[PDB]
């Protein structure tokens, strides 16, 4: 009738040489970029993060050209493997934000969202080949649909049915996907109870907003006899309810894939995980 043995660690020695690709080196370099970047003798990102913390806006807006001006290699990493590098940037923002918030409360916050925008060259919606898959693309267009906000679990408590084993599943990343990559466990995880024995305790879970937008190539630059081409986009948290249908926008996103465009073999439906929306001057 004893308790749960604990496991803990402490740094004693230098380990193996910090390698540049290590997630912890990448997080350190993002943290240094956030804390040390200067634009016109101003720590623009540090001040922006602090102000966002004060207004309870748990997100950071970053221009990727500023990242080019700081570290080109890890800009390459972000622009070529966004799905693996964006969570590291969000972790760096979360650490810096925790430090800033605790240091500023004397005269918890969730994982921060990286809303990255850019002014680089934009790929036309008709010029998206299969080489852009799982990569950061900038593409212009017009929003023709904005779905209702849907609730996505970012932290949910679960309990086994034929037990009372309490567990928590945290979703801080991979919130932008048509499917659900992380589901409830198929076993009790207390190691028989059965398949999928967990139920969600909804009064102790945390949820976030998601929205489906429908980008379309502007109808001015369309072939005379063909359908204008549209593209599904998914945004979450602070990128929701930012634009209305009919708004001409510049979308920075990850050109990704989901499985559902009719009769075909091994074909897939492309979409865009939105990392930032840049609305232009529109109807007031």
């Amino acid at each position: 009738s004893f308790d749960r043995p604990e496991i803990y660690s402490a740094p004693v020695l230098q380990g193996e040489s910090p390698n540049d690709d290590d997630n912890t080196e990448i997080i350190k370099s993002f943290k240094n970029f956030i804390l040390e970047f200067r634009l016109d003798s101003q720590f623009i990102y540090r001040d922006q993060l602090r102000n966002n913390i004060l207004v309870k806006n748990y997100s950071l807006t970053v221009n990727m050209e500023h990242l080019i001006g700081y570290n080109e290699d890890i800009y390459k990493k972000l622009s070529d493997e966004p799905s693996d590098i964006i969570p590291l940037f969000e972790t760096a923002i979360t650490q810096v934000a925790k430090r800033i918030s605790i240091l500023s409360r004397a005269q918890s916050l969730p994982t921060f969202q990286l809303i990255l925008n850019s002014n680089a060259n934009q790929i036309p919606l008709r010029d998206l080949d299969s080489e852009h898959v799982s990569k950061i693309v900038r593409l212009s267009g017009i929003i023709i649909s904005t779905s209702v906000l849907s609730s996505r679990a970012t932290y949910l408590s679960i309990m086994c049915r034929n037990c009372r084993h309490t567990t928590s599943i945290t979703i801080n990343n991979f919130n932008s996907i048509t499917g659900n990559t992380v589901s409830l466990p198929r076993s009790c995880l207390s190691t028989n109870c059965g398949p999928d024995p967990y139920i969600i305790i909804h009064e102790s879970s945390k949820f976030i907003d998601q929205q489906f937008l429908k980008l379309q190539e502007i109808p001015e630059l369309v072939p005379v006899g063909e359908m204008p081409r549209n593209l599904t986009m998914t945004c979450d948290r602070y990128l929701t309810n930012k634009v209305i249908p009919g708004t001409r926008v510049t979308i920075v996103g990850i050109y990704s894939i989901y499985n559902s465009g009719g009769s075909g073999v091994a074909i897939r439906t492309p979409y865009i995980k939105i990392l930032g929306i840049q609305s232009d001057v529109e109807t007031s």
Binding site: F2, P5, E6, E16, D22
Partner: protein
């Protein structure tokens, strides 16, 4: 309450979790072995020392590092035991038994397991008639599985203090009170005859 001597039979499950004193005779003492409490490992990748607490009879060693750096990274480090950095306890498992004056009529005395840890080891030897004060604690069941009806638990006594009824001649120290008593014996005179005649004084 914690010092009134109890027999092995008188220690029921109501006394479980309490600090209690058991009066008995020690019948078997094991060798002082190193029982691991917090096993330590070193990781050659991140340079961390990962400590895993041990609570039961057996434990499963860690294979991959669980420190901040390795958990955050994708190339985990394989971590090796560090015996010198691990936390060990001098462990003894003594067995106390009911005295003949405590066993009821027609009964066989029953024994109790005493778990001696730390600097308290080597304070109990077989044949010692002692008052052992310790925390009566439960242990996971170790009997036959088919005979388990519920959450049955074994019990032991995590020894905290030992009082010897008959102090050993080797552990004699000439403190002040020992000295005053010896002078009050000597000054009375006739030590040899007094001590001889005091051996079984009803024998004549």
């Amino acid at each position: 309450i914690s010092s009134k001597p109890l027999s092995v039979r008188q220690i029921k499950g109501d006394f479980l979790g309490q600090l209690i004193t058991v009066r008995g005779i020690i019948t078997r003492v094991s060798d002082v072995k190193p029982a691991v409490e917090v096993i330590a490992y070193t990781c050659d990748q991140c340079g961390y020392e990962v400590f895993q607490e041990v609570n039961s009879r057996t434990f499963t060693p860690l294979s991959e590092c669980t420190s901040e750096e390795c958990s955050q990274n994708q190339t985990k480090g394989q971590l090796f035991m560090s015996t010198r950095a691990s936390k060990f306890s001098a462990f003894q498992e003594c067995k106390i038994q009911e005295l003949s004056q405590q066993v009821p009529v027609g009964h066989i005395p029953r024994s109790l397991n005493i778990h001696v840890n730390g600097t308290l080891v080597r304070s109990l030897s077989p044949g010692d008639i002692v008052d052992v004060t310790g925390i009566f604690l439960p242990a996971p069941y170790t009997g036959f599985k088919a005979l388990k009806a519920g959450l049955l638990t074994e019990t032991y006594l995590e020894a905290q203090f030992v009082r010897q009824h008959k102090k050993k001649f080797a552990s004699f120290s000439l403190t002040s009170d020992v000295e005053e008593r010896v002078m009050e014996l000597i000054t009375s005179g006739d030590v040899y005859n007094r001590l001889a005649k005091s051996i079984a004084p009803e024998i004549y």
